[PDB]
RNA sequence: AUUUUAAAAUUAUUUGAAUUUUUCUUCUUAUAAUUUAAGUUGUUUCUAUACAGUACUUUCUUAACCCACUCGUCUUGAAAC
RNA sequence: CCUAUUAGCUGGUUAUUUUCGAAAGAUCUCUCAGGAUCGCUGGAGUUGAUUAAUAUAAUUUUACCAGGUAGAGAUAAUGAU
RNA sequence: AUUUCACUCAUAUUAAAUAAAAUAACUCCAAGUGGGCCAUUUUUGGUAAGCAGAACUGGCGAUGAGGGAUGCUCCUAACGC
């Protein structure tokens, strides 16, 4: 396994409820599932969203079980869908999102680098909601249709990247850029 | 440049909405005893015996009782230390404290609980629980009753 | 020249240097001007016990010393 | 740096010199604590004439002993040698600077037959 | 970088070692330091602490006060770390045994012919090492004129401090601030 | 005199067998506790009737900032939490009062669930104990059970066995354990902090806050 | 008494056993499980895995209840969005 | 020189017991050792087979890498134009 | 010569190490370049603690108090509009 | 209201939590100080100011060390060898 390529997201699911009070003798139970860097980070994000959408926090919310309900097969190949909401330096804007990877864990996280590179939206400004599964033909994005084509090809004109072993400073002569 | 007796008391000594008028009839009907904790709350309707600038809303022991006045022992912080101060105010400006009723019922509880506990010879503690972590219990959440919610986008 | 008119800087730090002291909490306080005609009666109360105790002790001392 | 010879460890050599004693020349090199205000040596600025402190103090087990591994004792005549007859292997004798030649000879011979060692044995001869 | 009161060093207040270069007193404090260290006696500990006290904290004890203090147990031994002084106000003294630092000559003579005897602290250590049947006393430490000037300054309300004046006449420190007629009072 | 040596010799074997039987009892207790917790979680897995543990009643707190530029009440909270150096660590019993008083100092510490192996490591390799007399404590490494027995043997919690047996599950004696234990003087992290200036909970890298169960790695990296 | 070297209470076997009288028993008891031959685990792995069919089925049931709940929440979210779109 | 002892562990036993079921399974009845206890000891060379050097100790003078602004003082603030 | 007049003002004020260690607030002052006095500091001493407690705490919790700043309003009063 | 006799309210984890809480408390003698300044947050006058005047906290003064090339006040962090 290679640590450099991998992010640090795993599955979890923790269940609880708001505190049963004298006023609320029989409160209802609720749940929601997001992934983040850590289980604690995801719990904090969940409580922030609970405070923003409803009125409850740790002072009036408790949890009564915890489990790690991982995926059916992490080695699968998927196409899912989520909903993005973010803010710029002058307003707020929303859209949807879909991407392909092996599992939801990185499926959540491939988006942040693109957002930061393009719109300089720091991760504290983006909101992602309602993960589900998308179709392969329903996508109206330009790039993602050729992903599941019947047959496709392109060359490999990327520049070489050798090891620190063989990145020797003084070369006998100039290298080329064809390879293969 | 202005440090009068009632300076800066525009709102502190102002009478509350709907609360204008002299004190109620039986406000004069409180059994005050010596060494009794009591709050000192100014009543601007009564002018004699008015509590001074800083002691409004404070609490202190009763060290003096007169025919219509009360001497209250209130600790006041000045510079580098707290020192005792004896303030003599009329009884309309005095309201019986609610610090000792927290333990009055506790000390009645003692004479009925600790007595029976010892006479039957059990060990039971009485200190306040300062409850933090909730205990562990077996629960039954209904699969029909369980309902799901989710967050919301921008609008 | 102009002088610093006033500032509260460093003041409570100086206070907490030696700490905010508290009254010593003596058990008995003098009642020199505290509700006369009542503690005068208490003064009269004390002598009642004092006289009987003193006479009893003196009689016991004399009867035991012969 | 530190000197480590045998069990004797000296935490610092090249004894401290007075600040500005090099360029200023009525100022003797003997150390003096500089009071000043902006002296930079009391302020302990980097890389300038660090002051002596208590951290440099040598181990009290091996404090006043020489590289001889013995404590020095100065003597004026042969009548100050007796106390060394119980400590001939803990103390080394040293003649006083103002002792004459033949007195020096007659105490050096006494120290020799006493088997105690002398530091300045080759003086005035 | 540590957050401790006075860099985490415990500080003690008061005398550490006696500062009197009196050889017999030095022997006494050495003996009683040994006794306090070895025996578990708070009695010996207190005597060892009191032996190194300053002169103002070893006040004289009068014969009358000694007799009054020891009135309720005559067979016990009084022991004080100060001097014993004669009280002419006492008509008669009887059968008192007391150990003390110093005895005034008249008080010693009076104790002697009253039937008692005067013991020094070496004798007290010799025949009562653990302080059995020995009651230890001390004279009035702050009854001297020095603390009559101490406390609240003379001029504060309800201040009993004695001022520093040349003479106690009407012409000295009596007019303004010491009577209601002139400005204020006290 | 002559009887004294055998009198003191026999009590050694008496206490030895007493504590041996007690170690048998606590071994039985660890086995029973593990079986009970696992079976109570498996019962939750069985049906739609959940089970859990609440907040574990004990947290481990590590200071993160120095001794300069701190609010007075933050300094007081540090003082009465015994967190006085930059890399000090303590065990804190968890309740409403102490959790509230620690929330005011949260931006200068990181704290979380210690777990059993980590508490054992901390006590065994970094555990120091106040063996001296009251207010003269004279920090000393454990290295034995004699001092633990001297301070707690009359209170029958003598032994580092018992101290771990007691610190993990916060039983009736936490006073005489936490206060008896010297504040842990931890090393800097082997791999380093992420950002002491930012919370562990912000999306950007950060350190301070409640790591919950994620502090075991930090502790055994700092140990 | 004089201070000696603080022996590592985790790696020094003698001092660790002196601290924990049960440590040697626990270590030997675990070393026995380690010494248990590969044949036993090879024969018993299938039995242990097949004895947990009920447990994995119950876990699957709970997870599929979660999945159905998520799907129905998706359905309700879409119905509300469609209703309020016009 | 009247706790580097007691125990703790290990070895060689032995006693009985015990249970994970035994070649690092566990505990005393008893013994003898040893250290993993109870903060470093051992082997071989060299100094060296000399009375002071080309070595070793030290002083001094030169460089070199990094650092280093005149002190005293008034001052909130001095290297101060 | 009185006279080494006085100066709330300027400058100077001589060995080492160790330990503790500030204030530039306040009241009064023919006071505003000063002084006195509180406050901060050191030294000395006693009473204590030395009994993992009690006193105690720039901390929290529980219970109970007092407020009218932020905010909010013109249909709730005044002042506007 | 005071006094004296009875009984007795966990006191063997401590009438809530935590606490290098007695490094406490008190007294005496006395030095220096009594021109302050800066930073975050709040705020008054001013068009504004590295301006003038205030509140809280922390620093500079009185203090160096690593970093911000550079810098009395910024970040880390305060100092025996």
PDB file of N, CA, C and O in Angstrom, chain A residues 15-16 37-41 43-45 58 63-67 123-124, chain F residues 44-45 50-54 200-205 210-214:
ATOM      1  N   UNK A  15     -25.117   6.457  16.136  1.00  0.00           N
ATOM      2  CA  UNK A  15     -26.541   6.714  16.290  1.00  0.00           C
ATOM      3  C   UNK A  15     -26.809   7.241  17.693  1.00  0.00           C
ATOM      4  O   UNK A  15     -26.183   6.806  18.668  1.00  0.00           O
ATOM      5  N   UNK A  16     -27.721   8.206  17.778  1.00  0.00           N
ATOM      6  CA  UNK A  16     -28.140   8.785  19.038  1.00  0.00           C
ATOM      7  C   UNK A  16     -29.486   9.471  18.926  1.00  0.00           C
ATOM      8  O   UNK A  16     -30.340   9.036  18.147  1.00  0.00           O
ATOM      9  N   UNK A  37     -12.248  13.849   7.527  1.00  0.00           N
ATOM     10  CA  UNK A  37     -10.900  13.351   7.788  1.00  0.00           C
ATOM     11  C   UNK A  37     -10.894  12.322   8.912  1.00  0.00           C
ATOM     12  O   UNK A  37     -10.241  11.280   8.810  1.00  0.00           O
ATOM     13  N   UNK A  38     -11.618  12.595   9.992  1.00  0.00           N
ATOM     14  CA  UNK A  38     -11.649  11.715  11.149  1.00  0.00           C
ATOM     15  C   UNK A  38     -13.087  11.489  11.587  1.00  0.00           C
ATOM     16  O   UNK A  38     -14.001  12.214  11.188  1.00  0.00           O
ATOM     17  N   UNK A  39     -13.279  10.463  12.417  1.00  0.00           N
ATOM     18  CA  UNK A  39     -14.591  10.242  13.015  1.00  0.00           C
ATOM     19  C   UNK A  39     -14.979  11.405  13.919  1.00  0.00           C
ATOM     20  O   UNK A  39     -16.138  11.834  13.926  1.00  0.00           O
ATOM     21  N   UNK A  40     -14.023  11.929  14.690  1.00  0.00           N
ATOM     22  CA  UNK A  40     -14.303  13.091  15.527  1.00  0.00           C
ATOM     23  C   UNK A  40     -14.626  14.315  14.679  1.00  0.00           C
ATOM     24  O   UNK A  40     -15.531  15.090  15.012  1.00  0.00           O
ATOM     25  N   UNK A  41     -13.889  14.509  13.584  1.00  0.00           N
ATOM     26  CA  UNK A  41     -14.174  15.625  12.688  1.00  0.00           C
ATOM     27  C   UNK A  41     -15.567  15.500  12.085  1.00  0.00           C
ATOM     28  O   UNK A  41     -16.306  16.487  11.993  1.00  0.00           O
ATOM     29  N   UNK A  43     -18.099  13.881  13.428  1.00  0.00           N
ATOM     30  CA  UNK A  43     -19.056  14.138  14.500  1.00  0.00           C
ATOM     31  C   UNK A  43     -19.228  15.632  14.734  1.00  0.00           C
ATOM     32  O   UNK A  43     -20.350  16.115  14.929  1.00  0.00           O
ATOM     33  N   UNK A  44     -18.123  16.381  14.726  1.00  0.00           N
ATOM     34  CA  UNK A  44     -18.212  17.827  14.898  1.00  0.00           C
ATOM     35  C   UNK A  44     -18.978  18.472  13.751  1.00  0.00           C
ATOM     36  O   UNK A  44     -19.797  19.371  13.970  1.00  0.00           O
ATOM     37  N   UNK A  45     -18.720  18.029  12.519  1.00  0.00           N
ATOM     38  CA  UNK A  45     -19.454  18.557  11.373  1.00  0.00           C
ATOM     39  C   UNK A  45     -20.937  18.225  11.473  1.00  0.00           C
ATOM     40  O   UNK A  45     -21.794  19.060  11.157  1.00  0.00           O
ATOM     41  N   UNK A  58     -24.457  19.349  21.789  1.00  0.00           N
ATOM     42  CA  UNK A  58     -24.061  18.409  22.834  1.00  0.00           C
ATOM     43  C   UNK A  58     -24.799  18.684  24.137  1.00  0.00           C
ATOM     44  O   UNK A  58     -25.085  17.757  24.904  1.00  0.00           O
ATOM     45  N   UNK A  63     -25.568  10.449  22.216  1.00  0.00           N
ATOM     46  CA  UNK A  63     -25.467   9.316  21.313  1.00  0.00           C
ATOM     47  C   UNK A  63     -25.485   8.028  22.123  1.00  0.00           C
ATOM     48  O   UNK A  63     -24.988   7.976  23.251  1.00  0.00           O
ATOM     49  N   UNK A  64     -26.075   6.987  21.534  1.00  0.00           N
ATOM     50  CA  UNK A  64     -26.410   5.775  22.257  1.00  0.00           C
ATOM     51  C   UNK A  64     -25.870   4.518  21.582  1.00  0.00           C
ATOM     52  O   UNK A  64     -26.058   3.419  22.116  1.00  0.00           O
ATOM     53  N   UNK A  65     -25.200   4.643  20.435  1.00  0.00           N
ATOM     54  CA  UNK A  65     -24.416   3.535  19.898  1.00  0.00           C
ATOM     55  C   UNK A  65     -23.471   4.057  18.827  1.00  0.00           C
ATOM     56  O   UNK A  65     -23.686   5.133  18.265  1.00  0.00           O
ATOM     57  N   UNK A  66     -22.441   3.264  18.534  1.00  0.00           N
ATOM     58  CA  UNK A  66     -21.438   3.587  17.527  1.00  0.00           C
ATOM     59  C   UNK A  66     -21.022   2.310  16.813  1.00  0.00           C
ATOM     60  O   UNK A  66     -20.810   1.280  17.461  1.00  0.00           O
ATOM     61  N   UNK A  67     -20.892   2.378  15.488  1.00  0.00           N
ATOM     62  CA  UNK A  67     -20.456   1.234  14.701  1.00  0.00           C
ATOM     63  C   UNK A  67     -19.699   1.744  13.484  1.00  0.00           C
ATOM     64  O   UNK A  67     -19.729   2.935  13.163  1.00  0.00           O
ATOM     65  N   UNK A 123     -11.542  24.931   2.664  1.00  0.00           N
ATOM     66  CA  UNK A 123     -12.442  23.842   3.027  1.00  0.00           C
ATOM     67  C   UNK A 123     -13.470  24.251   4.072  1.00  0.00           C
ATOM     68  O   UNK A 123     -14.509  23.594   4.193  1.00  0.00           O
ATOM     69  N   UNK A 124     -13.209  25.317   4.828  1.00  0.00           N
ATOM     70  CA  UNK A 124     -14.177  25.814   5.797  1.00  0.00           C
ATOM     71  C   UNK A 124     -15.354  26.531   5.150  1.00  0.00           C
ATOM     72  O   UNK A 124     -16.222  27.026   5.877  1.00  0.00           O
TER      73      UNK A 124
ATOM     74  N   UNK F  44     -26.369  -5.631  21.202  1.00  0.00           N
ATOM     75  CA  UNK F  44     -26.776  -4.525  20.343  1.00  0.00           C
ATOM     76  C   UNK F  44     -26.730  -4.923  18.875  1.00  0.00           C
ATOM     77  O   UNK F  44     -27.635  -4.584  18.103  1.00  0.00           O
ATOM     78  N   UNK F  45     -25.675  -5.633  18.467  1.00  0.00           N
ATOM     79  CA  UNK F  45     -25.613  -6.097  17.082  1.00  0.00           C
ATOM     80  C   UNK F  45     -26.756  -7.046  16.749  1.00  0.00           C
ATOM     81  O   UNK F  45     -27.162  -7.139  15.585  1.00  0.00           O
ATOM     82  N   UNK F  50     -29.916  -0.720  20.567  1.00  0.00           N
ATOM     83  CA  UNK F  50     -28.529  -0.287  20.575  1.00  0.00           C
ATOM     84  C   UNK F  50     -27.901  -0.426  21.961  1.00  0.00           C
ATOM     85  O   UNK F  50     -28.584  -0.555  22.980  1.00  0.00           O
ATOM     86  N   UNK F  51     -26.569  -0.413  21.977  1.00  0.00           N
ATOM     87  CA  UNK F  51     -25.784  -0.374  23.202  1.00  0.00           C
ATOM     88  C   UNK F  51     -24.520   0.433  22.955  1.00  0.00           C
ATOM     89  O   UNK F  51     -24.042   0.536  21.823  1.00  0.00           O
ATOM     90  N   UNK F  52     -23.982   0.998  24.031  1.00  0.00           N
ATOM     91  CA  UNK F  52     -22.799   1.842  23.948  1.00  0.00           C
ATOM     92  C   UNK F  52     -22.224   2.016  25.344  1.00  0.00           C
ATOM     93  O   UNK F  52     -22.795   1.565  26.339  1.00  0.00           O
ATOM     94  N   UNK F  53     -21.077   2.680  25.397  1.00  0.00           N
ATOM     95  CA  UNK F  53     -20.605   3.342  26.601  1.00  0.00           C
ATOM     96  C   UNK F  53     -20.717   4.844  26.389  1.00  0.00           C
ATOM     97  O   UNK F  53     -20.543   5.335  25.270  1.00  0.00           O
ATOM     98  N   UNK F  54     -21.013   5.569  27.459  1.00  0.00           N
ATOM     99  CA  UNK F  54     -21.064   7.022  27.394  1.00  0.00           C
ATOM    100  C   UNK F  54     -19.635   7.554  27.414  1.00  0.00           C
ATOM    101  O   UNK F  54     -18.674   6.817  27.179  1.00  0.00           O
ATOM    102  N   UNK F 200      -7.911  20.929  16.273  1.00  0.00           N
ATOM    103  CA  UNK F 200      -7.926  19.612  15.650  1.00  0.00           C
ATOM    104  C   UNK F 200      -9.184  19.391  14.822  1.00  0.00           C
ATOM    105  O   UNK F 200      -9.196  18.519  13.947  1.00  0.00           O
ATOM    106  N   UNK F 201     -10.234  20.174  15.066  1.00  0.00           N
ATOM    107  CA  UNK F 201     -11.534  19.938  14.457  1.00  0.00           C
ATOM    108  C   UNK F 201     -11.783  20.776  13.210  1.00  0.00           C
ATOM    109  O   UNK F 201     -12.728  20.485  12.468  1.00  0.00           O
ATOM    110  N   UNK F 202     -10.974  21.803  12.960  1.00  0.00           N
ATOM    111  CA  UNK F 202     -11.128  22.579  11.741  1.00  0.00           C
ATOM    112  C   UNK F 202     -10.689  21.754  10.532  1.00  0.00           C
ATOM    113  O   UNK F 202      -9.845  20.863  10.653  1.00  0.00           O
ATOM    114  N   UNK F 203     -11.262  22.022   9.354  1.00  0.00           N
ATOM    115  CA  UNK F 203     -10.845  21.267   8.159  1.00  0.00           C
ATOM    116  C   UNK F 203      -9.367  21.412   7.843  1.00  0.00           C
ATOM    117  O   UNK F 203      -8.738  20.448   7.391  1.00  0.00           O
ATOM    118  N   UNK F 204      -8.795  22.590   8.068  1.00  0.00           N
ATOM    119  CA  UNK F 204      -7.360  22.754   7.922  1.00  0.00           C
ATOM    120  C   UNK F 204      -6.641  22.016   9.051  1.00  0.00           C
ATOM    121  O   UNK F 204      -7.225  21.768  10.109  1.00  0.00           O
ATOM    122  N   UNK F 205      -5.384  21.623   8.841  1.00  0.00           N
ATOM    123  CA  UNK F 205      -4.659  20.906   9.897  1.00  0.00           C
ATOM    124  C   UNK F 205      -4.562  21.735  11.169  1.00  0.00           C
ATOM    125  O   UNK F 205      -4.315  22.942  11.132  1.00  0.00           O
ATOM    126  N   UNK F 210     -10.561  18.427  21.326  1.00  0.00           N
ATOM    127  CA  UNK F 210     -10.830  17.069  21.782  1.00  0.00           C
ATOM    128  C   UNK F 210     -10.538  16.103  20.640  1.00  0.00           C
ATOM    129  O   UNK F 210     -11.316  16.008  19.686  1.00  0.00           O
ATOM    130  N   UNK F 211      -9.421  15.383  20.740  1.00  0.00           N
ATOM    131  CA  UNK F 211      -9.108  14.342  19.770  1.00  0.00           C
ATOM    132  C   UNK F 211      -9.931  13.080  19.973  1.00  0.00           C
ATOM    133  O   UNK F 211      -9.853  12.172  19.138  1.00  0.00           O
ATOM    134  N   UNK F 212     -10.706  13.003  21.056  1.00  0.00           N
ATOM    135  CA  UNK F 212     -11.495  11.823  21.389  1.00  0.00           C
ATOM    136  C   UNK F 212     -10.608  10.587  21.466  1.00  0.00           C
ATOM    137  O   UNK F 212      -9.734  10.496  22.334  1.00  0.00           O
ATOM    138  N   UNK F 213     -10.818   9.634  20.565  1.00  0.00           N
ATOM    139  CA  UNK F 213     -10.047   8.399  20.549  1.00  0.00           C
ATOM    140  C   UNK F 213      -8.728   8.524  19.798  1.00  0.00           C
ATOM    141  O   UNK F 213      -7.954   7.563  19.773  1.00  0.00           O
ATOM    142  N   UNK F 214      -8.451   9.677  19.191  1.00  0.00           N
ATOM    143  CA  UNK F 214      -7.269   9.862  18.361  1.00  0.00           C
ATOM    144  C   UNK F 214      -6.049  10.311  19.151  1.00  0.00           C
ATOM    145  O   UNK F 214      -4.995  10.550  18.555  1.00  0.00           O
TER     146      UNK F 214
END
